[PDB]
Amino acid sequence: ANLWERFCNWVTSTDNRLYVGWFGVIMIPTLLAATICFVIAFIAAPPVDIDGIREPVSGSLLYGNNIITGAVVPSSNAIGLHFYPIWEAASLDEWLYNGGPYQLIIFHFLLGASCYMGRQWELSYRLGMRPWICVAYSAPLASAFAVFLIYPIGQGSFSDGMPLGISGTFNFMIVFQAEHNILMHPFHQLGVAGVFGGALFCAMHGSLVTSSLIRETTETESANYGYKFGQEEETYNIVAAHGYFGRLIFQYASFNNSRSLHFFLAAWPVVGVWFAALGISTMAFNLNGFNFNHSVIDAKGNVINTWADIINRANLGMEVMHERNAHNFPLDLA
Amino acid sequence: TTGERPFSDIITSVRYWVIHSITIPALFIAGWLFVSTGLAYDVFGTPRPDSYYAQEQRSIPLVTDRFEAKQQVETFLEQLK
Amino acid sequence: IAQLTMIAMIGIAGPMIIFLLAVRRGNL
Amino acid sequence: ERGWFDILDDWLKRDRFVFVGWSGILLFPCAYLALGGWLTGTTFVTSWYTHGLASSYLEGCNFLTVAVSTPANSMGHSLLLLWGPEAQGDFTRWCQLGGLWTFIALHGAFGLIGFMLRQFEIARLVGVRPYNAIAFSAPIAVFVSVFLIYPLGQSSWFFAPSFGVAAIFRFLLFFQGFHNWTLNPFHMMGVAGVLGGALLCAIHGATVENTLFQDGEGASTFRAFNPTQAEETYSMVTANRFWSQIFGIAFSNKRWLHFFMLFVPVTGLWMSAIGVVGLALNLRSYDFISQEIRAAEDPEFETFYTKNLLLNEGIRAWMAPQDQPHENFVFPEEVLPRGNAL
Amino acid sequence: METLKITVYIVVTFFVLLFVFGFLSGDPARNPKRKD
Amino acid sequence: KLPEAYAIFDPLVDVLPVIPVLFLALAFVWQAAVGFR
Amino acid sequence: GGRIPLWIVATVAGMGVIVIVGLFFYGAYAGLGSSL
Amino acid sequence: ATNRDQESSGFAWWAGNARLINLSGKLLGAHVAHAGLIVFWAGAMTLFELAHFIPEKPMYEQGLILIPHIATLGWGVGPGGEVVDTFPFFVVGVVHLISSAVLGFGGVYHAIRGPETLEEYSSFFGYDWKDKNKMTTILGFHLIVLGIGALLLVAKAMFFGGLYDTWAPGGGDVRVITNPTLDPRVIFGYLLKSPFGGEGWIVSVNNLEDVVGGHIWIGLICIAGGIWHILTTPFGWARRAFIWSGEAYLSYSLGALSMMGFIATCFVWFNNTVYPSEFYGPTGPEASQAQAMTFLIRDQKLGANVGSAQGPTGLGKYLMRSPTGEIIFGGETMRFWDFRGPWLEPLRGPNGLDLNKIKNDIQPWQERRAAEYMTHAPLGSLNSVGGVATEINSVNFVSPRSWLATSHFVLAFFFLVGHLWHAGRARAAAAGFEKGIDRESEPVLSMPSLD
Amino acid sequence: MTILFQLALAALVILSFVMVIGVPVAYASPQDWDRSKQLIFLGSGLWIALVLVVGVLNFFVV
């Protein structure tokens, strides 16, 4: 056929070792750009004035960091939410001082990861699958949007986006607790239920299927050779697994329907992480965790502290120390 | 399948609700009175709102001695009256 | 202050519709 | 023949609504007392004499702030038995001294033992391999390291976690400010195991649900499964091709897949437990010495690592007077660490 | 910088046009079953 | 405040905004009465 | 045996749960724990 | 009972409303009854707000979101946004509440009493989802209805009292709009503005002339488009690009509403023109700027030369330069220098904030407004304790801007999820594999191995 | 007029509560639908009439 038809046929081909697709034509260049800039910056970028106070923070390995302390540092508070591409800087030296790499990386990453999700829809369609793996992926994806884009928008600066680094991540978490009391927010609590529960049900399902593998091997070989890729029969006895778990708790607390079971495995962590993402995305607009500071009062009016008041003392320590040279006025309003 | 009567049979039966229209409110009222009479405070040693501090004190009555801790609490309580 | 009474009549209206229809073998 | 032991064994293993077993003789009293102890304390019992805190519904706390709080630091690691030398059989004083804390921690520990014995006992009776009990060793390693070993290495039970929502949050923030626990590679492995386990849970459930065979006419597809059926309900071959083309690699062995789902979260929790055993002794990953040497000599050198230490220093100074009342800390305003204005 | 800006604008426009015209090129029919 | 003539209905006005939520719960009462068929 | 329909039991039980939890939220604003 | 179980319909109870896809009569009832619920809430919630309304407190101190919408249209308020007459709020609430009974009546009728399908009863009201011209015709009717709605806003602004204008010279006031902006270079220029800082896309609209003129354009565009879709049928290229099914159309609208929800979130968070701060409280940027203004005023009264005051970092403690040189407030609020508001603009000259105006021309009302906004910043807890997260209980406050921003982000996000859910399902159903893979015709088994 | 107002509005609330229960029960009832249809017609017209009465009387009690 014509060259455009052949090109379209290759792009959407189900026979490519890695599927490309139309989402892929955006995903591949954007993710390569973000990856290459990230790696180069992580190794070699000079210090970045994250808080706009001419106090540059060193993030790269060559400038004194190890793997745990290193980061790509968010762009300057003086930029705020302004779009700061390379061509807006007078020079690369200026671009680097002000944290230009961070914006390039997170914007290419967020676009590429959004296309990764669309690409999961697209291949499922080409293969004749049902379509909702991409909906499961929307939960981690929404969480990345929350910490790299929505929280900066609500606070008015990409300098408050999560840094691209291990210790920078912890910095973001501690400051977030000081300013939003996230631990006391029910959407973060649902998030914890989601990931604790996800890990629990992962171990549970793994242990139950492994416990009921049908004997197909000898004592001196891995039991994994008892399963052959593409065999039609199930490789474990779900009736035995349910017979075990239903007696562990009680019969009606156990799944006998594999489709119901696996739907539950999908839904529990996905919904929980959706609420995690929505916690960050709504604390982005300063609707914060529950505040019970001085909620308990005695007959005279003395404050009777609760554990919430002890949390408050810890939060205060974080608040008064963070960004120790950046505040001139008494209230931290963003 | 384990021999016991199904729950859906039990809680839709008239006899169940003849019994439990009495026992459930009775327990609820018993728990209410446990608090409203003040007995809960005295069983567990929980301060009433007027019993955290004496009128002018502002130091918490923290237990500081392991083996005479019982007498220390008793002394703390006497200082309220 | 009287608010509880209102919520009771309003709150019962829904289940009462289902009950009246179930009693008369209606088109639930 | 059938002696009284075998007659008892018969009754214990009857197929009833709630299975009992020999393990049930340990599990049910201990689990019930731990749970009942927690509900009793959070509803009625104060922490005024151990912590200077209200901690019960009776005092005005809500579900997020109630707790059964640890005993006073002056108790040391006393078992704090009701009949012991501290409470001397006085139930009211026992409650005021923190006796419900060791009651719950100790009955909880033996209940967890009873539960894992139950997993073994039932697996043996129905004829399956005991991997569910094996995987439960991770919850046990966490409970034992956090609620027993950690306070046993510290000055007293006071510094164990108190049993409550906000009390546990305080425990997290204490570990950040005092131990720099986020920097600890054993915690990091724990995080990877928990988040990796949640990832595996979600991706496996979603993959199965989206590679199902059409085994019925309904648009709601749950009814098209029969527990006794021999056939796989989803296509491993299609699932494998999808992930190979999306992500580059894919499972091909279902037995390996499900073992991996056990391995990842179980191993992560085990690693986090090892780090907490270190923190029992204050053997922290608190600092990078090379960073501190450079920063001390060069007042322009700043990383996210040094920024977080300043947060920790604030946490310690601002929370310690009320969080550690036995120390009688008095920190004058002028010594408190603070940045500009705040 | 101006040359860099023009270059990136052209690159982005190129890939965006591929995306849009690609999905306009009979995408519902690109499946293994009923094409319509 | 509402105009003074309507003040007798203040307790009713306080409850009205929640009524839409009751419609969602009613769907479950109805489905329970037909056995979630 | 089965004289009281299960949907009525569930509805009444569920309404009782709403009432008691509603009472507990009321108490967050009044008396002890209200900050007042 | 037609189609009201899983066996007949193929859908379980928890997907029960999918049983309605091809039952146009009952589906009409569901839609009309749902519109009744929306209108019911608007009326009931307004009456609740009014009953709880103390007119001498700011609206934003009282948990109000609907009365602020009515007041922005110029009803019930006067200079500075002060409430002069609550009767319009009462009218809006009652009329919505009465109307919801009408909608609920028709909804319940069509849902359980009227014909389950409309096609046998009426060719006009009956429809096949796959009848493309019938779909564009109903779309056209609704576009015309929407265009009329946009022109009702215009009529209110131009002929029936005007709108509340926070920017009115001499102070905010209700103002009749007599010269709406009609220049398409201005109206559509908003659409081509970057959404990033200092630009803000359409969220940057900052005067009522542009607002009204925009709605004139939107009104005519929707009426023209509606007539167009009544008179035409989808072109071949459109026919080949879309899925034509009830669930596909729903998925398209879900994507549209998600986008609109994200836009509304940013509108209420940043814009103080169509969300006047008199009614909604200050924006986040606004309150932060107001803090800097407050301590500039205080310290300057004490004798500080605020232009030459060097802060600890070397930047000006009160005043500094933006990255393009404009004079702006210092401290962390450097990020908010794109903020514009009527209490601050009198201090701005060509190069930004003007030191001579700061030294000589700050009026007491500006000090008041800055103090008010700094102390009603949109920060507060989920249980409505106002202030930073470490603040003690005392002030019962969460800004309406936070309530409206958070709620609509949550709803927009879930509507994006719903879009992906129904778009992916509509595709799979149109292609015939939404119920799973055919064991005897598994597509991957006919493909060459990857390696 | 205040007595006429308070009577008309209380009647409107009562009739509304009667219609809210009675209309769906009648619509879904097999028996006696002809008697129901006329009642629903009557209730609806009376409902509309009361709204107008309350609306008019509003301006003579405020």
Ligand code: CLA
């Ligand atoms: C399997 C069930 C079980 C287990 C393992 C435990 C375990 C425990 N309980 Mg709990 N308890 C239980 C059920 C259980 N309990 C029940 C059913 C009740 C309600 C009655 C309680 C009520 C309870 C209270 C009120 C308290 C405990 C406490 C304890 C702890 C200390 C116990 C101790 O020192 O006993 C020692 C006794 C034995 C180990 C028995 C050994 C028997 C030997 C082998 C036989 C020899 C007997 C000997 C001949 C007798 C001679 C006496 C003579 C010389 C004078 C320990 C963790 C204490 C606590 O938690 O402190 C914080 C505490 O205060 N329990």
Ligand code: CLA
């Ligand atoms: C906005 C919410 C909403 C609306 C408008 C609808 C509407 C509808 N549903 Mg769905 N549904 C919903 C939410 C909703 N549903 C939810 C949350 C669930 C999960 C529980 C379902 C699960 C579900 C299933 C499983 C089914 C439906 C069906 C239907 C249709 C017929 C219902 C019927 O026959 O009832 C019979 C009920 C009665 C006769 C009892 C009375 C019902 C009336 C309407 C209550 C009116 C109360 C009101 C206060 C009266 C005001 C009167 C006043 C104005 C005068 C109808 C169009 C059915 C269908 O698709 O038909 C083909 C169907 O099988 N729904």
Ligand code: CLA
């Ligand atoms: C856009 C919707 C919206 C917004 C922004 C507001 C905002 C506000 N309301 Mg209003 N209201 C609404 C809708 C809304 N409301 C609805 C639907 C009702 C009927 C129930 C009401 C009835 C109402 C009353 C009676 C009152 C308010 C009040 C208030 C004020 C205080 C709110 C508060 O304390 O929340 C508390 C916070 C919560 C209750 C948390 C809600 C969390 C939900 C469950 C999360 C939902 C997530 C998502 C939808 C679920 C997805 C499930 C997933 C699996 C997909 C605040 C201005 C108060 C006020 O001050 O009036 C003057 C007041 O008394 N509102």
Ligand code: CLA
């Ligand atoms: C979008 C909403 C909508 C739609 C598409 C329909 C459509 C239909 N209705 Mg239903 N109905 C509705 C809402 C709706 N109705 C409401 C709100 C009520 C309660 C009042 C009813 C009560 C009702 C009854 C009792 C009956 C119908 C019937 C019908 C069918 C015959 C219609 C006809 O011949 O009218 C011909 C056209 C006219 C009579 C012109 C009417 C002009 C209107 C009143 C002016 C509208 C102005 C403006 C657009 C209103 C804006 C409203 C907005 C602000 C909410 C048709 C399928 C009949 C039926 O199903 O046959 C068995 C029937 O008996 N409807």
Ligand code: CLA
């Ligand atoms: C609810 C509103 C609505 C909806 C759902 C439709 C739906 C439709 N329209 Mg109609 N239209 C409308 C309103 C609407 N129209 C109005 C108000 C007017 C007057 C201006 C028109 C004038 C109109 C014409 C002249 C035509 C249509 C056509 C169509 C059909 C093809 C749609 C399409 O492919 O767009 C998808 C758009 C593209 C594929 C263009 C390229 C995609 C770019 C990249 C979009 C970028 C958007 C991006 C998100 C940026 C957003 C913000 C931006 C302002 C910066 C479809 C049935 C076509 C048809 O077949 O007629 C019968 C057609 O020729 N419409």
Ligand SMILES: CC1=C(/C=C/C(C)=C/C=C/C(C)=C/C=C/C=C(C)/C=C/C=C(C)/C=C/C2=C(C)CCCC2(C)C)C(C)(C)CCC1
């Ligand atoms: C405006 C107005 C009005 C109106 C009214 C109305 C409109 C009403 C409605 C109402 C309604 C509409 C109601 C409803 C209700 C409902 C309910 C109350 C429900 C509940 C539920 C539950 C409780 C559930 C349970 C369950 C089940 C059933 C199953 C599963 C399980 C569970 C548990 C979940 C009137 C007349 C007053 C007059 C004045 C004015």
Ligand SMILES: CC1=C(/C=C/C(C)=C/C=C/C(C)=C/C=C/C=C(C)/C=C/C=C(C)/C=C/C2=C(C)CCCC2(C)C)C(C)(C)CCC1
């Ligand atoms: C300690 C002790 C003891 C014991 C005791 C006991 C054993 C007790 C028990 C107790 C109990 C056993 C109690 C219980 C309680 C319960 C409760 C208190 C509950 C509540 C609940 C609720 C409130 C609910 C909620 C919810 C949820 C959860 C989800 C969904 C929905 C809702 C929200 C509803 C003895 C004597 C041995 C000795 C001494 C010491």
Ligand SMILES: CC1=C(/C=C/C(C)=C/C=C/C(C)=C/C=C/C=C(C)/C=C/C=C(C)/C=C/C2=C(C)CCCC2(C)C)C(C)(C)CCC1
């Ligand atoms: C279909 C269906 C459904 C749904 C339904 C619906 C959604 C309905 C709606 C309905 C509606 C939507 C209704 C409404 C109503 C309303 C009314 C009934 C009102 C009345 C009003 C009044 C009576 C007023 C009065 C007053 C005045 C005039 C002045 C001021 C004061 C007051 C407020 C008192 C469900 C889910 C169940 C499921 C089954 C099926």
Ligand SMILES: CC1=C(/C=C/C(C)=C/C=C/C(C)=C/C=C/C=C(C)/C=C/C=C(C)/C=C/C2=C(C)CCCC2(C)C)C(C)(C)CCC1
């Ligand atoms: C009112 C107003 C105004 C105005 C506004 C306007 C004038 C607007 C317009 C707007 C517009 C005018 C919009 C548009 C939109 C569009 C869209 C949104 C599109 C979409 C598309 C799509 C979605 C497509 C897709 C696809 C592709 C891409 C490929 C192939 C396949 C398909 C077809 C699927 C202003 C601001 C001045 C001021 C304020 C007020």
Ligand SMILES: CCCCCCCCCCCCO[C@@H]1O[C@H](CO)[C@@H](O[C@H]2O[C@H](CO)[C@@H](O)[C@H](O)[C@H]2O)[C@H](O)[C@H]1O
């Ligand atoms: C952002 C700018 C883009 C705005 C474009 C607005 C759309 C207006 C009409 C554009 C139509 C595009 O034209 C589109 O591309 C080519 C041109 O023959 C066609 O070509 C396609 O046809 C068939 C459809 O089965 C495909 O299998 C084939 O592989 C492909 O080449 C599409 O069928 C046609 O629909």
Ligand SMILES: CCCCCCCS[C@@H]1O[C@H](CO)[C@@H](O)[C@H](O)[C@H]1O
């Ligand atoms: C506490 C349980 C462990 C100790 C069990 C010792 C059993 S002892 C054993 O028991 C038989 C009956 O069971 C008797 O018939 C027999 O004579 C006796 O030796």
Ligand SMILES: CCCCCCCS[C@@H]1O[C@H](CO)[C@@H](O)[C@H](O)[C@H]1O
């Ligand atoms: C659809 C019902 C809308 C009811 C609108 C009532 C008119 S609104 C009314 O109009 C006057 C000019 O005539 C203005 O001066 C006045 O301020 C305004 O409130």
Ligand code: OEX
């Ligand atoms: O930048 Mn990063 O952190 Ca958000 O709060 Mn304000 O700003 Mn800064 O202080 Mn706190």
Ligand SMILES: [Cl-]
């Ligand atoms: Cl910091």
Ligand SMILES: [Cl-]
């Ligand atoms: Cl500042």
Ligand SMILES: [Fe+2]
């Ligand atoms: Fe599995």
